[PDB]
Amino acid sequence: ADGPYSGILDSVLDAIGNTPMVRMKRLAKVYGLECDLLAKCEFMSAGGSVKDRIGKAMVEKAEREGRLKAGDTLIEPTSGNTGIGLALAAAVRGYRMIVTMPAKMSAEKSNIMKCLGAEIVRTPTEAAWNDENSHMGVAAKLQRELENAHILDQYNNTANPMVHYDVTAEEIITQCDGDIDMVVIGAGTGGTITGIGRKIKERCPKCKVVGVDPKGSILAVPDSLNDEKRLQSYEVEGIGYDFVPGVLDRKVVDEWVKVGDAESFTTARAIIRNEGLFVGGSSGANVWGALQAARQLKKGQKCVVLLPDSSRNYMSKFISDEWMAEHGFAPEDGAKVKEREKQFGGARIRDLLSETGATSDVPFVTARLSVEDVIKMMHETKVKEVIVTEDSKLVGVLSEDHIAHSLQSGRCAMQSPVKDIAFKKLAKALPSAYLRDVAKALDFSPYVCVMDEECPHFLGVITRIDLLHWLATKQ
Amino acid sequence: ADGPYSGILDSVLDAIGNTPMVRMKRLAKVYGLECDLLAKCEFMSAGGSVKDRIGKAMVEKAEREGRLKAGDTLIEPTSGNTGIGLALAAAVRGYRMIVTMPAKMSAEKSNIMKCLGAEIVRTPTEAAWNDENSHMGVAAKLQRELENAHILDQYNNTANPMVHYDVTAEEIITQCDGDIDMVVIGAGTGGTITGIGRKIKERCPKCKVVGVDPKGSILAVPDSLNDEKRLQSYEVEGIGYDFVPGVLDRKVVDEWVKVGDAESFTTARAIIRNEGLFVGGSSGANVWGALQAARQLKKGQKCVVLLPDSSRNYMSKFISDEWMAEHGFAPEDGAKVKEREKQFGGARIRDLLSETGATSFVTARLSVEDVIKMMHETKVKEVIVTEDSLVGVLSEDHIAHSLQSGRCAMQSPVKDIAFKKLAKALPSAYLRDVAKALDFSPYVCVMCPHFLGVITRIDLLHWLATKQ
């Protein structure tokens, strides 16, 4: 039915949480996991992360104890999501926000927290927590140097674990109807894992609690697990630290799984591809840890894994295949890059032009020709498409269909220059280019022209239908 | 309580819809609107857009009539989301996806549907619908040339308006408790506006229905409203077309408001800043139309506006202030760019260096022993290591802490412990640009390599304290 949202909400803070739980049947079938892999889609909150909860939570406590008045300044060290939640809470309830986050974190978090009118100071990535230039040390410095400023310190604020203990874990319990055998949580500040594990062990002691920390962090026990990449920087954001946070109660968790960047990102992309959850990299790390931990489980029992934040915070970072290739990470078993490598192989556009047969030079027009002259030339030459010149780059292509339809639509005058009706989005290529790169370029441009700018002697235009015909010529 | 999600969900398709309605009290107070401006946060769906609904809906219909079997190919022209929704439905229920979208649409939509294993064909932006190179014409061509391919044709499929008439409008009715005075909807395919307006007028005929169309489309009535920028391309994606779709029943809507790109984007940024809803540009267009239409309303009555999709699809496009300045769009009334322009003004780093009095190098391969000796003998705290063909900065605090942390041996080269993220500046640069650059780099170094020092945000705050 409609219980939580059947009414009107006073602000966006009332729309955080209440995230649904989805069964990842397809992903489990892909990785061959017999038990039921449940996913807590915390990334569908208002701010798109679990930390939104704690943000609101801390503010509520700060307002319930009278320690916060309107117009004050709020300071918080964060990896980006807790800053987002506190920025939402401040923009709603009238507080000033200043965030301290390392330069390792994505630019989307910085831009969206700027959209909430929050000042953002970046800290060096390689800095240790003891340094005065760390996000926490710099936040303390800012609190010392600013009037009416406050740090809620999610690393030490009891609201962070207490609310995951109060509402989030209760949500997981009500959705799983009490039957939970394993729960896998990423280890960042440690509040989410501490709270949820404590509540579930209280209401279901048979449930195992597994924590995920990236190779480079020191949050796993024993220290034999951290020796892989001791204190080595990683690309995944949100989990792992060079110190044990005050809220992290490592005694509530049973197992620890170390996950690297490559596995985390490949599993996040597999999540997006097979399940359809627009989720972030830390969730890929958590899901890889869950897949490695619950392999010994059998059918019927449920292993619950949390997906902290959405792909929105890493839109340019790891959804783009170019950046995932720059870091040498396997995209996925079934992906478009691998599909195009398998289908096309070492085929170049020269092979396609030879198999079809160009043996021709497409017509040419000076890009300022009148529509009368270009229509006369097109009717006398019998060709359909034409390419307009440059004057100094290339302008584009034009077909008789657009000519007629724009002339009759009142958008192309007969005395108008041909540049006004040409297609302006194009991609330059060369006969030596492979089919995979031109296929990737077709993802962003409708046409692809060859050998632009010896001499500018283009051979033809290339679209996706040509690639489909080339695939049809094979078996 | 917990009614719709208190249980387990079989797939992501069960997470579409059920979006909450929020009262934009702060935005109304900013723009001086007396009535209650309610916002339907359809961007909070699983796929982050309203079109997800119709996507699922069409697939359900295609499966309810047996017209769809496993392994088939699905083709659909879309501005971006209806492709995302159908890609989700196909990846879940085992269908192949091929999308046709104009090059005008953002790259985030294409990348997100590529992550869903969907083929993406781009079409020219200026092409008309009758052209064979339009997304709809090219989709028809693909249907002709591909085996087992299907187009559900959201422009003509009755599922698109029928489901907004069945569940979405019923949702808004149940949350608003029937009392709705005005409904403001963007005009894209026109299915959502038709469905929602028809259902609400059936269950509340006194409610006025106003449609929002961008300056450039011809969907408004009368045609005197489209004459501003006739058939000229605009930057907002999702709303407006050069033809009336088959599902669009223009007779159900009363008013029409034309909105430009600048107003739409500035209002979307104002939505994000004042309310905290990560929404797209079409939502800004709809909200500007609502602010222009419901101005005559009074306290107590409610004007509901749809927020189609989230900022996720335009992260690089219009959330970035650089692109908003490249297109000459006013950022916002209260924004970080305007705040720094007001606080800093035309101040450059020369003025800060003169007011503070900073009168004022390592080859990046000296051993830690020698650098500690130099640091103790020179009494300075920070040092900057040079280049060989710039490497970064290093302080004694990080030196000591990395020595004790087991990461920096005394015989190790200093490059291993230096800070690698840096930003280059020059004394002529203003304070606003270095403040914007500090959003991405912790330090900022000036300018032969004869730099005088490093400047961070605390220095800018001290400079602001030295003024006023």
Ligand SMILES: C=C(NCc1c(COP(=O)(O)O)cnc(C)c1O)C(=O)O
């Ligand atoms: C420490 C912070 N992030 C926690 C986090 C985590 C870890 O969640 P914890 O509540 O810290 O246990 C996992 N994934 C992402 C994307 C995260 O951002 C923060 O936002 O300040």
Ligand SMILES: C=C(NCc1c(COP(=O)(O)O)cnc(C)c1O)C(=O)O
């Ligand atoms: C053409 C399309 N426009 C829908 C749309 C709309 C208009 O919603 P309609 O259901 O098309 O009436 C508003 N905002 C955005 C971001 C949209 O994508 C589409 O979704 O395929």
